[PDB]
Amino acid sequence: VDQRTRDALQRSVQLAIEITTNSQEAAAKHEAQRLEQEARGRLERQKILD
Amino acid sequence: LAPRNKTRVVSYRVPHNAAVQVYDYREKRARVVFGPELVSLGPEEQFTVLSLSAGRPKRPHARRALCLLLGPDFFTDVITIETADHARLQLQLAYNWHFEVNDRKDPQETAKLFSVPDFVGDACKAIASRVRGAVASVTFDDFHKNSARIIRTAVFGFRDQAVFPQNGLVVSSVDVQSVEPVDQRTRDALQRSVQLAIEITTNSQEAAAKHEAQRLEQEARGRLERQKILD
Amino acid sequence: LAPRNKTRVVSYRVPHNAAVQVYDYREKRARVVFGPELVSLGPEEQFTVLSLSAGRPKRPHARRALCLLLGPDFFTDVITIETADHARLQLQLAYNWHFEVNDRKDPQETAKLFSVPDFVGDACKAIASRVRGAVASVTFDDFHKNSA
Ligand SMILES: Nc1ncnc2c1ncn2[C@@H]1O[C@H](COP(=O)(O)OP(=O)(O)OC[C@H]2O[C@@H](O)[C@H](O)[C@@H]2O)[C@@H](O)[C@H]1O
Ligand SMILES: Nc1ncnc2c1ncn2[C@@H]1O[C@H](COP(=O)(O)OP(=O)(O)OC[C@H]2O[C@@H](O)[C@H](O)[C@@H]2O)[C@@H](O)[C@H]1O
């Protein structure tokens, strides 16, 4: 009934879609860090071989 | 436009999938006929008018009509439901339906299709309550990713047929065509998400190109130092 | 332009891939005929008008028509779907379709093609729901790379 209760539930949407896109961004950052670490390890192994 | 003749027998041409039930009030015999046949009223036979539901938001009293189609049609209804994260969103279902008649010459089963007066409103609310009860228990991410299993195996959860034993109406698989949110704030935070998704996509592409360029530069540098040692 | 003669028998020239179902209301016999034949209505035979779907965004009531083509045609429909990264995008499908008739002289199977009144709207929504349900579960990169 209340527009205050219909606004706090709205604020909740954002806190839900905000933590959803934050989890997506954090998972993308962790995958990018893992790929960067793998590429860096391959680069240092190839530099030691060179 | 032209006024009808009151003397002539009232004849209604029933289509092959539609069905009309006539009440012969003189002998209190109710018969329902379907097929290519045009039904002819007697001295006191009267049609069964069905105040159905029509339109997009499914108004409860519209499309009044003598016939009742039993063929595989579909009615599209917008339903505004709320998820478990209090992000309300309006969505559409196709509602593929057909009346399943086991025997077409049975005075009781063929007249059972005219039990509920508004089968389009009843089949919309009975499938709107299920959708609202099944989506409000799951979050926005699980509903936006998997929007079809929890609306089809939930609307008619374990079987693929949503039978209605009041009138014999079955409902086939429901085909969603929009899961668009109501709020423009929710339609903007999902947009911001596009960029964070296309931004991390082009960042992964740029990082992979940079790592491949660094690997090729290191290989060329190692070949250059080996050739310089040989020189 | 010219007004038709109400006396003359209503004849409709059916094309080789189209199909018309006529309801002989006088004997309650429904027959559906296809081929090069022009069908002639009797004293009470009436055509099966199909309120189909037409246009790009596939409006549900347009192109009303007596015939029903069974040949390998295609309808193009724009569908606006959302990916798993909340990046909604509108896309088009060709929808190559044809009616598969196992036997062309069967009173039941040949009349089964006129069961759904709007086969173009039903075949668009049934294929739009599948596309929206299959693309919303996969991300933008996997959909833009492997879109087929
Ligand atoms: N006189 C009637 N008697 C029995 N059933 C009817 C009648 N009129 C409509 N119905 C059923 O109720 C449904 C109500 O549909 P609407 O909400 O009016 O139209 P919509 O839901 O936007 O789309 C339905 C679509 O399905 C096709 O059958 C039809 O060509 C239409 O485009 C119809 O699809 C039809 O199957
Ligand atoms: N009277 C009819 N009876 C039966 N089927 C029909 C009828 N009219 C159209 N159809 C089918 O429904 C489809 C609806 O098509 P539209 O949306 O009107 O046109 P579009 O989807 O833009 O393109 C279809 C294209 O396919 C070709 O068959 C046709 O030449 C057209 O260019 C048609 O392609 C046709 O196969």
From Swiss-Prot, chain A:
Protein modification: Phosphorylated on Tyr residues after EGF stimulation.
Expression (tissue specificity): Present in most normal tissues. Higher expression observed in epithelial cells with secretory and excretory functions, as well as in cells chronically exposed to xenobiotics, such as bronchial cells and cells lining the intestine. Overexpressed in many multidrug-resistant cancer cells.
Top-level taxonomic group: Eukaryota
Signals that turn on the gene: Up-regulated by IFNG/IFN-gamma.
Transmembrane annotation, as ranges: none
Location of this chain's protein in the cell: Cytoplasm; Nucleus, Nuclear pore complex; Cytoplasm, Perinuclear region
Role noted for this protein: Required for normal vault structure. Vaults are multi-subunit structures that may act as scaffolds for proteins involved in signal transduction. Vaults may also play a role in nucleo-cytoplasmic transport. Down-regulates IFNG-mediated STAT1 signaling and subsequent activation of JAK. Down-regulates SRC activity and signaling through MAP kinases.
Domain remark from Swiss-Prot or TrEMBL: MVP 3 mediates interaction with PTEN. MVP 4 mediates interaction with PARP4.
Subunit annotation: The vault ribonucleoprotein particle is a huge (400 A x 670 A) cage structure of 12.9 MDa. It consists of a dimer of half-vaults, with each half-vault comprising 39 identical major vault protein (MVP) chains, PARP4 and one or more vault RNAs (vRNAs). Interacts with TEP1. Interacts with PTEN and activated MAPK1. The phosphorylated protein interacts with the SH2 domains of PTPN11 and SRC. Interacts with APEX1. May interact with ZNF540.
Protein known as: Major vault protein
Residues included from the entire protein: 646 to 695 of 893
